[PDB]
């Protein structure tokens, strides 16, 4: 499908959740990236679409304190800035 290669920070985030590799389809990236968030309970408990990452590598990565998963163009863009291919 869309085979991407994650940048250094993102690859580290990925390994953190078991993804042991250098090349991924867009789907694997999102899957693990979602597993990281769910696992480290980084979402707001009441408004689950709010994710907090100020205190997190995810924030270093996306370069923002928090974000709304409901803003597809934003999420997709931030994620793309960290990929190649």
């Amino acid at each position: 499908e869309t085979l991407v290669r994650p940048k250094p920070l993102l690859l580290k985030l990925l390994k953190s959740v078991g993804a042991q590799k250098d090349t991924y389809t867009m789907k694997e990236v999102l899957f693990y990236l979602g597993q990281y968030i769910m696992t480290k309970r980084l979402y707001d408990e009441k408004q689950q679409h709010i994710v907090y990452c100020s205190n997190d590598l995810l924030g270093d990565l996306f370069g923002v304190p928090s974000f709304s998963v409901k803003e597809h163009r934003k999420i997709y863009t931030m994620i793309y800035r960290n990929l190649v291919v």
Binding site: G34, M38, Q48, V69, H72
Partner: peptide
């Protein structure tokens, strides 16, 4: 609306 529901609606490619 839970996180997992929301997150799966992201562009998969």
């Amino acid at each position: 609306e839970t996180f997992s529901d929301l997150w799966k609606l992201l562009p998969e490619n």
